[model samples]
Target: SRKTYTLTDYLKNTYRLKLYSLRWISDHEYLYKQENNILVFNAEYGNSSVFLENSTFDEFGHSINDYSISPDGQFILLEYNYVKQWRHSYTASYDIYDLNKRQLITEERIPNNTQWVTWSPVGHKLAYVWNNDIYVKIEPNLPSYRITWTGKEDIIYNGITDWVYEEEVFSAYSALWWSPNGTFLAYAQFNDTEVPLIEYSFYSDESLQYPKTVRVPYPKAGAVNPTVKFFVVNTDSLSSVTNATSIQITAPASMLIGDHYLCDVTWATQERISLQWLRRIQNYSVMDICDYDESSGRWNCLVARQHIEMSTTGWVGRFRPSEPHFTLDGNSFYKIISNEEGYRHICYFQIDKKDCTFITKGTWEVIGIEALTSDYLYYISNEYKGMPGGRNLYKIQLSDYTKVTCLSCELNPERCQYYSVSFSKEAKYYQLRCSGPGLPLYTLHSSVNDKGLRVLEDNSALDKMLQNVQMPSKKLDFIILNETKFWYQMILPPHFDKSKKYPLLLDVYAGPCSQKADTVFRLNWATYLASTENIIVASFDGRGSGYQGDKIMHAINRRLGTFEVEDQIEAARQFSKMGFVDNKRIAIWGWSYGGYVTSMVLGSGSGVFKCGIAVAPVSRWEYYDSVYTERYMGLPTPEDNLDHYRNSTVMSRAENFKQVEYLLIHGTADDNVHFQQSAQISKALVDVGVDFQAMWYTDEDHGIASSTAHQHIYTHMSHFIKQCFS
Candidate 1:
């Protein structure tokens, strides 16, 4: 009665899983979209009301991409004409719709191709970035006032992130922040005047004779990075002031000594703000707790309130410095930081304290400081049963750190081990997202007694559909490498037989601070391959992978393509040693950094892998962005890691690629890892007299996310993999 999952089924998304996506508008109300209509649900009771009808804009003559409601739910911002810039950056046109009036406002609308926009935290006031300039509208229908004038295309950015900052640093498009009460607007300005640009060609439709060259102001490793400055403006004084001026909040003197990055900006209270600055080397960072001076109308970071976070082992944090979760009064805070044992834990700190008291400590690392209340601090950690791949929510009493209670660990432990949560505005309720050894389940709970209120979604439809299909079974297990437990996951065929030999495909993305082996439930190409082709799809988190500890994660620091590459090869050989694995049919594939590792492992001449695929891979560290590359491999300079950068290149091992079947793929318009990387690898292979298969998607970015191109690439890779095995 059951059918095997096929490539067509995977490509067409036949077994689509339904998810309950909601946005918490208040402590008790949340909005979710169903049948193109927005519905508001009361968390306390299963009551639903239509917030916005689907046909409200039937004759509006424009396609609506998304919608954002005001904090008070008085107004809604309809986003249309959406254009993507980078990974997390996009431009869109917005229209203000009055919910009570049930009509769209015609006057003083947000300009077309607006870079970024957001409503004030407490009001209907909106701030937007248009043409790289910042504008604030006190009311939705009011005329906008320009807040910045120095914005320039491709040079200076007022309230938006640049290409590097958007892709690497903040992971967001907007660079502006609003105060807790929406009184002050703090923003960071970026100047990319000196940074070099990465140029690429985009071939459009077949009719176009000439290819368009797109240029992005991108800084490669050891290049001139963008300069940033912070400023705060009082919205209250802007209306009456002749020329509204913003006071500058300079970085600390230590950070000014060298090239630095504005890593984090957080508002503790309406009158206090915290700024974290990271040095170019990325080993040390400083957090400045600045208090607003009423008389001087300036912000000052007292020396006594400055906090220094350094790492003698690696970078300051998993990526950047850990953001602090402050109390309501901003007098104290709790943050996850590395303890003396190299494990990340929550540390409680006062505003002026130099030393922080450890609130949680163990061999395991706390994933994040989820929510902080008057009496308890909620967090997500992997300490339950000491399984590093598993995640569970916990709460520790602020008064007594030892009084810890695991909230989600015992909640259907068999079906749910990995959990993520979204707390309501007042922390009165929370939505638990359980993804894992089972289907993803969503449920709402009252934080007062941690009682389950209702099930938002249980993925029961998906579960029922999968019941009629021969789905793959996932195995989450660990392999000991160098006496350390390294986690790996495999999607095995249904009714797996241990006595039969199966071809293996090592799907890798072993980048620094990257975790590939986890408990998240997913159905993709791997599932199809396992269910239909009987090929085992495995991912191993060896060296340089995250969430375990600094000792394991920082192992490949300053050495980009050595231990991680070797460990992957070792993992494959160990897999071959297993009686059920067909050593002759082992293959590897990865994208981006994982692509780099796949190429490195295939070129290692280990003879363990028969073939491998690399997509949009970095040929060398010098070719990557400065922030991401320099954080792990440092600068590609003579004094730093020039030698390693030179030796660790995929091109350097071009000759060894001849031993294995190599398939190199890249997108011509890859803004993150440029096509030049693959071009160099191909050039090196040609020079070394090595033959390989290569494919390039014109005008495609790093993700190859276009519907047709995504399927095309996967289909082509499937043929290559099948040929290699045959």
Candidate 2:
């Protein structure tokens, strides 16, 4: 089946649509937001009632960014933003209103430049960040107490992460974390006095006068990173005491011995906290177990124990591994780790790797562990199932470890291929999201002895619209080398012919821990290329690709651009060996990291690709962020990673791109990979007087949000490919 629908209909109806489970309150009840109000759905009643929502009449029509319900569902803490700060951070107003009382709880507006707001576990108590300092309020209409006072502009930061930590370590806007009991509050102190500023001029087309100057405290590779310190304080003391300093928890000795990153600052237990650190030269989770002593009243910090040490594997985790979801008892936890078959599996942190044994072992990878309970490990995986880009839910009995059962496999054997699920509190019911080989499906099901389920959203309208169209079909194949099977996917043209050769297009994004070959349905320019242009579009999961396992992925560790480029070339070479692909008419294209790979392969002198497009590519490692680049490319500061960086950068291989027809495109205002990346590549090509095409979208960021931009660029590239083949 292929889409005969016009590009406009497909783009308007299908592209960028999103759905969420929201917060599930019960087996038959759930919460979702719509029309500036919160709605609660009851499956049994088949109707939805208003939960705590925005007031019906408001001048600004403020949209709620996020909200959290207290344990008793009495207090609704709402976070709404009028302006954005950095990437994840925002200056938001925090509002608390009584759901039952239907009245505002606070008269005081959130302090100016308040960075964060959150509700505690038990009561109407709240914590917020103002001017980077953390403050606590025991109840509404009460005087807020300050916890830390050292926050100064660009000097010291408390309860809020700096730019790098926000992007990399915490992956959150706020550094403040609340414990389960609401008794203790944990936060990090960031001291960033030494890092240099990334100063730039904002040329606002809106104004007639001067362009504003913007300065952010940005640390480049090998630059001095922010020094981090951890602390915990008693919330009870905030309501009673006048001025109190926190119990400063120290870092482990291994972290102190060298430069390290403070990550995974999780409250593992009521009395103990778990921390993960990665040293500059040697990277792994040097986890510490810090305990709180109630008897002595002093924090027993820096009493370290290694939780998960790095084996021969280059780095740990899939992508910056998330903190382990602790068990119900809080003594043990579960996380995904790379095993021998090059796939990630589930295991508990080892007691000499002896107490640890694989709960689920396979060649395929564990997608994620969603919900945890004493009885069941509610998780999702692509195991034993013959499909790669799809997922299904399962229940593993924790007590036996071997008692496994599938909860989602029986949903719709034909239509449902890719699926994701979530469970309610106490594992009462679960919500499954099925993204498709056909139109998507969303359902809610019970977890008890009775497995009754309800259809949440069947996507009836989308299914109806698609019935008139012919959509391209997906065929999967593996290029076997030795015994391992590397997966690849082909987007075949409508009524694909076996007798005739067709122009081939390789759609690649072969980055580290990246997967391009999967079970999900895709509708984009590649589909258009396959359908209208009559080209076969292909994607391959090479050495650095994920879920196959860590050994394969880590092959690019400390060595980027080299093997990844080799893998693509070899894959293309093998693909050309197939019957239907015209060897003389082959092209490759990608955006972002894939763009970097496209450029690398074009410059490799592979003679396999006739033409290619690289959009917003990373021309060099030094031009990117620290956390992601340094972990994979090796350390760039305190000492130079001269030889490795020399090999990985695209500029070093400029001489090899002479024979290939190349098109380089970038947005001038791209902050992530920086416009400098594309500019540098253009410089090298021009310096050599090489003939290649280039395009720049003025004032567009890395995403190139201009509506006409994507269409124009693709249209331009399509013409370029046709010209190259002629």
Compare the candidates by lDDT and give the number of the best one: 1
Cα lDDT of model 2 by residue, 1-726, tens digit: 455734554445454434655687655677887657788877544588887546632653567666777666787766776466556777867777676776766666457557888777666677888888888887765778889889886778898888888876677888887777788888889988987777555565766497666667777666777888988888877654578569887767767887777777777777777777777644566776677788866677544245655646676676565567677656678777666565777877531233456788876778898888777887888773655566788778888878888777777867776788777766777778888766667887777642746777777766676566665677877888656678899998777887788888899999898888877776777777777667889999888987666767888887888777788888899889899999998999898899999999998887899999999999888777777777787676436564777667777678888888899999876666677789899998888877889998766667875677766776777788768665
Stretches of candidate 1 exceeding 4 Å from the true structure = none
Query: lDDT value for candidate 1?
Result: 0.92
Best by TM-score: 1
Per-residue error for 408 in candidate 2, Å, reads: 2.3
Residue 124 Cα positional deviation in candidate 1, in Å, after optimal superposition: 0.4
Model 2: lDDT of residue 453: 67
The TM-scores of all predictions, comma-separated, are 0.99, 0.91
Residues 156-207, candidate 1: write the lDDT tens digits.
9999999999988799999999999999999999999999999988898999
* lDDT accuracy of residue 88 in candidate 1: 90
Model 2 segments beyond 4 Å from truth?
Answer: 1-6, 10-20, 26-28, 43-47, 52-55, 58-72, 77-81, 153-155, 206-208, 301-305, 340-343, 349-355, 386-388, 450-452, 637-641, 706-726
